[PDB]
Structure formats: C-alpha cells, structure tokens
C-alpha cells in the first residue's frame, strides 16, 4: 500500500451462471464465514426474479444494478484544518462494489419473512427503480449536489 | 458433597468425644478444630466451640442444622463495611 502497488484480487466466477459479479455479491453478503447458505439464498432470489420478470434473470439483476451503481462519491479530508467532503469520480471496480454493499444492508432493514425473500423484493423493486436503493442513491445525489460547493476546495 | 455410597463424614477424635459427652450428659462446650466434620444427630442439643482461625466460636446444635457442617457456623472474615 505504501511501498509496492498491487492490483485487484481475482475471484472465482459464479459457477451456476459464469458471472464474476454474482460471486462477489454473494461473498460480500457472506457473514461470519458462511458461504454455503449464501449460495443457497442467492440462487433462490434470482429464480424468484426469473419467474417474475423475463426468463433471462441476468438482465434483470443487471438493470437493478445499474440504476443504483454510483458514479460519484464523498471523501472526507482535511487540508488547511477544515473538514472537506470532496466529491470524486469512482472507477468502475469500486462503483459496483459500493452499490451492492448498500443493497446488502438495505435488504436487512426491509424486514420480510426471510432473508431470501427480502433480497428478492429488494432486487425486484430496484428494477422498477422505486427501491430504497434508488432512495439511497437519490440521497447520495443530493449531498453530492451539495458537495459541488466543496468540489473546488483544496485537493480538488 | 460426599457420595451417598461413601456415607457422611465425621472425624475420629470428634466422634469419640461426642459419644463420651452424650453418654455422660451435655455438660460443657466441646473444643474442636475439625471444621470439616459433619453435624450428626448424635450431638443434638450441644454447644460446640468451633474454630475460625483465631477464636473458637460456640455453636448450638439444633434439629434443622443437622447435615450442615461443623465449620459452617464460624464466619472466618470480619467485614463491617467499606464505609466508616
């Protein structure tokens, strides 16, 4: 980090559909070293959406991802002794990373019958863009609009 | 607790002195150091000067106390309180 720069870590792709993003999503959903159950719920969530939306659930999760993927961030910094929330464009490897993380806790606060069911509803409601994910993304957009005043502060 | 197959516990010197005093009638307190012995009904209605470390505290044997130990009724610590 301070001496030698290194790149990203490669993650074995999703076995059931060949994606890297599904594997990463389920990994970040994994808690306390339990990937066995995590795989079970992610398959159940995608098949509920498969029967609800079009048969190819690949595109449904994709659109539910793009409408919440963030392109601008908020970074706390101090240069001259004042708190600066500098907005910066984020590279796509971090764009999609932060988007799915927020979705993870968005489902937990949904509070449905089961964890699998709430993820399914969260991913579906994001497809129509009425989801709390879009709510959070509009929330970050207003503060991002607010941070355009900070955008020309020190360390632009 | 000592297992029921093994029975209760009692000390040889204590047992011999208790039966002599019982046979000769309850006359005087019984001086003892054996706190580990168990209160057995043969010494009912007697005063036992049980040791706590510095002074032998008298205890009277009553029916409801039987089974509990001889050294149980001798608090070895004196803590009035952390106040004045």
């Amino acid at each position: 980090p301070r001496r030698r720069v290194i790149g990203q870590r490669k993650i074995l792709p999703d076995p059931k559909f060949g994606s890297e993003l599904l594997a990463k999503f389920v990994n970040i959903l994994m808690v306390d070293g339990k990937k066995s159950t995590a795989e079970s719920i992610v398959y159940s969530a995608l098949e509920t959406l498969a029967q609800r939306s079009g048969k190819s659930e690949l595109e449904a999760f994709e659109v539910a991802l793009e409408n919440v993927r963030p392109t601008v961030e908020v970074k706390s910094r101090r240069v001259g002794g004042s708190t600066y929330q500098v907005p910066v464009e984020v590279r796509p490897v971090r764009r999609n990373a932060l988007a799915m993380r927020w979705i993870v806790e968005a489902a937990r606060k949904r509070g449905d019958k089961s964890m699998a069911l709430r993820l399914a509803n969260e991913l579906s409601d994001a497809a129509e863009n009425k989801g709390t994910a879009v709510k959070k993304r509009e929330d970050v957009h207003r503060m991002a609009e607010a941070n355009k005043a900070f955008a020309h502060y020190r360390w632009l | 607790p000592r297992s029921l197959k093994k029975g209760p516990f009692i000390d040889l010197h204590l047992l011999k002195k208790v039966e002599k005093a019982v046979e000769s009638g309850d006359k005087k307190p019984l001086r003892t150091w054996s706190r580990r012995s168990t209160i057995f009904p043969n010494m009912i209605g007697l005063t036992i000067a049980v040791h706590n470390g510095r002074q032998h505290v008298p205890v009277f044997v009553t029916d409801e106390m039987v089974g509990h130990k001889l050294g149980e009724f001798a608090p070895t610590r004196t803590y009035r309180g952390h106040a004045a």
Binding site: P15, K16, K35, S36, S40, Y43 | -
Partner: protein, 127 residues
C-alpha cells in the same frame, strides 16, 4: 486400462480413476448427489467436464479421504484434472488458462507464541 489422477486442496487426498463409460460418477461407493450436500460443492467437481467434451463418455470411480467439505471438493477437482493429463495432453491452452492443473498450495498457518489466532495479536491498552 484406467487413467490415474491425484488431487489435494487443503489437507485432503483424492484418488480418481477414468474408464470409458456413459457419464456416471461414483464417490466413495456413493453417488455424488448423495455425498456432496452442497450444490456448489457438487458442481465444482463437474466444472472441467464442459470445456472438455468427454463428459458423456467417462465413467469415473473416485475415492477421497481427509479434509473437509470444500477441501475435498477442491481435491476432487484437482484429481480429475491430473487424470486427464495422462490422456490427451493437447487441451493445455484451454485447461491451464482456466486454472485447473494448478495445485492450490495455500494452507492453514501455524499458531504463533504471543498470538491468539496465529496472526491476531491480543488487544492491548496503550496506558
């Protein structure tokens, strides 16, 4: 008569044998669907059977010992891979590029004196 393979993911050993057949696999005198309860644990075994077309023509007797569920599955994967190596040795540009011949040397680290979890150091107060 029977092509041989060996596999070891973490602490397990796999004994993998190939014969021509109708695409049936037996694991420890037990079907794979019965043995590996986990769906991901199940299909990691058959992952190399897609890029290699020999899925429908190989009956595969396997005996795997030691390790745990994911470790035994990874060991199973590596053993089938090697067993194929002494058969065709002409699909390397595809199979290596997926990453199956590679033996996973990653391993559990020994505990250290003054550490709780072999790298975690006990939480301390500066004062």
């Amino acid at each position: 008569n029977q092509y041989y393979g060996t596999g070891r993911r973490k602490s397990s050993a796999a004994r993998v044998f190939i014969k021509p057949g109708n695409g049936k696999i037996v694991i420890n005198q037990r079907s794979l669907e019965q043995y590996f309860g986990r769906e991901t644990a199940r299909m990691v075994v058959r992952q190399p059977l897609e890029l290699v077309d020999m899925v429908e023509k190989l009956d595969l007797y396997i005996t795997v010992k030691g390790g745990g569920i994911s470790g035994q599955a990874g060991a199973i994967r590596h053993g089938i891979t090697r067993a194929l190596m002494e058969y065709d040795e002409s699909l390397r540009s595809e199979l290596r590029k997926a990453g199956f011949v590679t033996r996973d040397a990653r391993q559990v680290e020994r505990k250290k004196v003054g550490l709780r979890k072999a790298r975690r150091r006990p939480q301390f107060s500066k004062r």
